[PDB]
Design a binder for this molecule. Sequence first.
Ligand SMILES: [Zn+2]
Length: 46
Amino acid sequence: GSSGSSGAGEKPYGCSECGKAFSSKSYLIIHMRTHSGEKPSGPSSG
Ligand SMILES: [Zn+2]
């Protein structure tokens, strides 16, 4: 079967943080909004 590259060239707008593609740059940005942060770690001490 197939594993890896898509075939017809991957999309230029593909999130790496989680792994989500989008058929619209602007869209990707909106998605990245829930990825960027201010700390290198994820404190969940409530
Ligand atoms: Zn993402």
